[PDB]
DNA sequence: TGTTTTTGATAAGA
DNA sequence: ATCTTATCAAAAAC
């Protein structure tokens, strides 16, 4: 199968950053993954 | 060349 | 312009 873009570690962190107000576009770029992926891992309707 | 799993563009959104 | 969501083709792995 294909590996995940972010490990469970990165998920807790990104989750945090997102709650702290970091723009998904910025996080995408930095972690080198796609904005759509972030919206999947963390629905807007969940922050 | 083949399956699986997850990625990421993308279109649509009373 | 923005933001979000689910879809779906295919990249990534083996």
mmCIF file with all atom_site columns, C-alpha atoms (C1' of nucleotides) in Angstrom:
data_model
loop_
_atom_site.group_PDB
_atom_site.id
_atom_site.type_symbol
_atom_site.label_atom_id
_atom_site.label_alt_id
_atom_site.label_comp_id
_atom_site.label_asym_id
_atom_site.label_entity_id
_atom_site.label_seq_id
_atom_site.pdbx_PDB_ins_code
_atom_site.Cartn_x
_atom_site.Cartn_y
_atom_site.Cartn_z
_atom_site.occupancy
_atom_site.B_iso_or_equiv
_atom_site.pdbx_formal_charge
_atom_site.auth_seq_id
_atom_site.auth_comp_id
_atom_site.auth_asym_id
_atom_site.auth_atom_id
_atom_site.pdbx_PDB_model_num
ATOM 1  C CA    . UNK A 1 1  ? 0.000   0.000  0.000   1.00 0.00 ? 1  UNK A CA    1
ATOM 2  C CA    . UNK A 1 2  ? 0.967   3.651  -0.119  1.00 0.00 ? 2  UNK A CA    1
ATOM 3  C CA    . UNK A 1 3  ? 2.481   5.260  2.978   1.00 0.00 ? 3  UNK A CA    1
ATOM 4  C CA    . UNK A 1 4  ? 0.685   8.006  4.838   1.00 0.00 ? 4  UNK A CA    1
ATOM 5  C CA    . UNK A 1 5  ? 1.810   11.572 4.373   1.00 0.00 ? 5  UNK A CA    1
ATOM 6  C CA    . UNK A 1 6  ? 2.086   12.195 8.108   1.00 0.00 ? 6  UNK A CA    1
ATOM 7  C CA    . UNK A 1 7  ? 2.857   9.802  10.951  1.00 0.00 ? 7  UNK A CA    1
ATOM 8  C CA    . UNK A 1 8  ? 0.848   9.720  14.147  1.00 0.00 ? 8  UNK A CA    1
ATOM 9  C CA    . UNK A 1 9  ? 3.406   12.015 15.748  1.00 0.00 ? 9  UNK A CA    1
ATOM 10 C CA    . UNK A 1 10 ? 3.022   14.647 13.019  1.00 0.00 ? 10 UNK A CA    1
ATOM 11 C CA    . UNK A 1 11 ? -0.713  14.306 13.315  1.00 0.00 ? 11 UNK A CA    1
ATOM 12 C CA    . UNK A 1 12 ? -0.790  15.336 16.993  1.00 0.00 ? 12 UNK A CA    1
ATOM 13 C CA    . UNK A 1 13 ? 1.490   18.233 16.255  1.00 0.00 ? 13 UNK A CA    1
ATOM 14 C CA    . UNK A 1 14 ? -0.302  19.399 13.110  1.00 0.00 ? 14 UNK A CA    1
ATOM 15 C CA    . UNK A 1 15 ? -3.579  18.945 14.973  1.00 0.00 ? 15 UNK A CA    1
ATOM 16 C CA    . UNK A 1 16 ? -2.187  21.327 17.579  1.00 0.00 ? 16 UNK A CA    1
ATOM 17 C CA    . UNK A 1 17 ? -0.841  23.835 15.088  1.00 0.00 ? 17 UNK A CA    1
ATOM 18 C CA    . UNK A 1 18 ? -4.238  23.839 13.403  1.00 0.00 ? 18 UNK A CA    1
ATOM 19 C CA    . UNK A 1 19 ? -6.033  24.568 16.686  1.00 0.00 ? 19 UNK A CA    1
ATOM 20 C CA    . UNK A 1 20 ? -3.499  27.307 17.354  1.00 0.00 ? 20 UNK A CA    1
ATOM 21 C CA    . UNK A 1 21 ? -4.627  28.894 14.088  1.00 0.00 ? 21 UNK A CA    1
ATOM 22 C CA    . UNK A 1 22 ? -2.057  27.832 11.504  1.00 0.00 ? 22 UNK A CA    1
ATOM 23 C CA    . UNK A 1 23 ? -3.295  28.060 7.861   1.00 0.00 ? 23 UNK A CA    1
ATOM 24 C CA    . UNK A 1 24 ? -3.641  24.654 6.240   1.00 0.00 ? 24 UNK A CA    1
ATOM 25 C CA    . UNK A 1 25 ? -1.900  25.989 3.146   1.00 0.00 ? 25 UNK A CA    1
ATOM 26 C CA    . UNK A 1 26 ? 1.151   26.873 5.195   1.00 0.00 ? 26 UNK A CA    1
ATOM 27 C CA    . UNK A 1 27 ? 1.159   23.536 6.974   1.00 0.00 ? 27 UNK A CA    1
ATOM 28 C CA    . UNK A 1 28 ? 0.743   21.756 3.658   1.00 0.00 ? 28 UNK A CA    1
ATOM 29 C CA    . UNK A 1 29 ? 3.765   23.482 2.132   1.00 0.00 ? 29 UNK A CA    1
ATOM 30 C CA    . UNK A 1 30 ? 5.961   22.986 5.169   1.00 0.00 ? 30 UNK A CA    1
ATOM 31 C CA    . UNK A 1 31 ? 5.126   19.311 5.649   1.00 0.00 ? 31 UNK A CA    1
ATOM 32 C CA    . UNK A 1 32 ? 5.287   18.881 1.899   1.00 0.00 ? 32 UNK A CA    1
ATOM 33 C CA    . UNK A 1 33 ? 1.823   17.385 1.496   1.00 0.00 ? 33 UNK A CA    1
ATOM 34 C CA    . UNK A 1 34 ? -1.481  18.436 0.060   1.00 0.00 ? 34 UNK A CA    1
ATOM 35 C CA    . UNK A 1 35 ? -4.105  20.754 1.447   1.00 0.00 ? 35 UNK A CA    1
ATOM 36 C CA    . UNK A 1 36 ? -6.803  18.225 0.553   1.00 0.00 ? 36 UNK A CA    1
ATOM 37 C CA    . UNK A 1 37 ? -4.990  15.634 2.681   1.00 0.00 ? 37 UNK A CA    1
ATOM 38 C CA    . UNK A 1 38 ? -5.049  17.951 5.684   1.00 0.00 ? 38 UNK A CA    1
ATOM 39 C CA    . UNK A 1 39 ? -8.774  18.596 5.291   1.00 0.00 ? 39 UNK A CA    1
ATOM 40 C CA    . UNK A 1 40 ? -9.166  14.787 5.274   1.00 0.00 ? 40 UNK A CA    1
ATOM 41 C CA    . UNK A 1 41 ? -7.072  14.151 8.363   1.00 0.00 ? 41 UNK A CA    1
ATOM 42 C CA    . UNK A 1 42 ? -8.589  17.208 10.086  1.00 0.00 ? 42 UNK A CA    1
ATOM 43 C CA    . UNK A 1 43 ? -12.037 18.306 8.866   1.00 0.00 ? 43 UNK A CA    1
ATOM 44 C CA    . UNK A 1 44 ? -12.739 22.000 9.430   1.00 0.00 ? 44 UNK A CA    1
ATOM 45 C CA    . UNK A 1 45 ? -15.769 20.665 11.253  1.00 0.00 ? 45 UNK A CA    1
ATOM 46 C CA    . UNK A 1 46 ? -13.479 19.318 14.036  1.00 0.00 ? 46 UNK A CA    1
ATOM 47 C CA    . UNK A 1 47 ? -11.318 22.185 15.299  1.00 0.00 ? 47 UNK A CA    1
ATOM 48 C "C1'" . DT  B 2 1  ? 2.540   -5.753 -14.945 1.00 0.00 ? 1  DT  B "C1'" 1
ATOM 49 C "C1'" . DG  B 2 2  ? -0.943  -6.360 -10.749 1.00 0.00 ? 2  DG  B "C1'" 1
ATOM 50 C "C1'" . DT  B 2 3  ? -3.276  -5.194 -6.133  1.00 0.00 ? 3  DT  B "C1'" 1
ATOM 51 C "C1'" . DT  B 2 4  ? -3.683  -2.263 -2.288  1.00 0.00 ? 4  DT  B "C1'" 1
ATOM 52 C "C1'" . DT  B 2 5  ? -3.786  1.792  0.255   1.00 0.00 ? 5  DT  B "C1'" 1
ATOM 53 C "C1'" . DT  B 2 6  ? -3.431  6.330  0.723   1.00 0.00 ? 6  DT  B "C1'" 1
ATOM 54 C "C1'" . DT  B 2 7  ? -2.424  10.696 -1.727  1.00 0.00 ? 7  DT  B "C1'" 1
ATOM 55 C "C1'" . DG  B 2 8  ? -3.840  14.961 -3.725  1.00 0.00 ? 8  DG  B "C1'" 1
ATOM 56 C "C1'" . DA  B 2 9  ? -6.243  17.636 -7.576  1.00 0.00 ? 9  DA  B "C1'" 1
ATOM 57 C "C1'" . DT  B 2 10 ? -10.544 18.942 -8.324  1.00 0.00 ? 10 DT  B "C1'" 1
ATOM 58 C "C1'" . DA  B 2 11 ? -15.337 20.326 -8.739  1.00 0.00 ? 11 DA  B "C1'" 1
ATOM 59 C "C1'" . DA  B 2 12 ? -19.172 21.687 -6.501  1.00 0.00 ? 12 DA  B "C1'" 1
ATOM 60 C "C1'" . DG  B 2 13 ? -21.272 23.938 -2.798  1.00 0.00 ? 13 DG  B "C1'" 1
ATOM 61 C "C1'" . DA  B 2 14 ? -29.899 24.545 -1.097  1.00 0.00 ? 14 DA  B "C1'" 1
ATOM 62 C "C1'" . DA  C 3 1  ? -11.334 36.472 -4.285  1.00 0.00 ? 1  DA  C "C1'" 1
ATOM 63 C "C1'" . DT  C 3 2  ? -11.936 32.268 0.037   1.00 0.00 ? 2  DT  C "C1'" 1
ATOM 64 C "C1'" . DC  C 3 3  ? -13.051 27.861 2.388   1.00 0.00 ? 3  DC  C "C1'" 1
ATOM 65 C "C1'" . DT  C 3 4  ? -14.691 22.957 2.735   1.00 0.00 ? 4  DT  C "C1'" 1
ATOM 66 C "C1'" . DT  C 3 5  ? -16.161 18.466 1.511   1.00 0.00 ? 5  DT  C "C1'" 1
ATOM 67 C "C1'" . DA  C 3 6  ? -16.331 14.044 -0.853  1.00 0.00 ? 6  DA  C "C1'" 1
ATOM 68 C "C1'" . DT  C 3 7  ? -14.906 11.989 -5.293  1.00 0.00 ? 7  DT  C "C1'" 1
ATOM 69 C "C1'" . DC  C 3 8  ? -11.761 9.576  -7.979  1.00 0.00 ? 8  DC  C "C1'" 1
ATOM 70 C "C1'" . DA  C 3 9  ? -7.475  8.862  -10.866 1.00 0.00 ? 9  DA  C "C1'" 1
ATOM 71 C "C1'" . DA  C 3 10 ? -3.110  7.296  -9.836  1.00 0.00 ? 10 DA  C "C1'" 1
ATOM 72 C "C1'" . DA  C 3 11 ? 1.482   7.639  -7.109  1.00 0.00 ? 11 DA  C "C1'" 1
ATOM 73 C "C1'" . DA  C 3 12 ? 3.833   4.899  -3.952  1.00 0.00 ? 12 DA  C "C1'" 1
ATOM 74 C "C1'" . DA  C 3 13 ? 4.844   0.379  -2.180  1.00 0.00 ? 13 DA  C "C1'" 1
ATOM 75 C "C1'" . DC  C 3 14 ? 5.503   -4.369 -2.563  1.00 0.00 ? 14 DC  C "C1'" 1
#
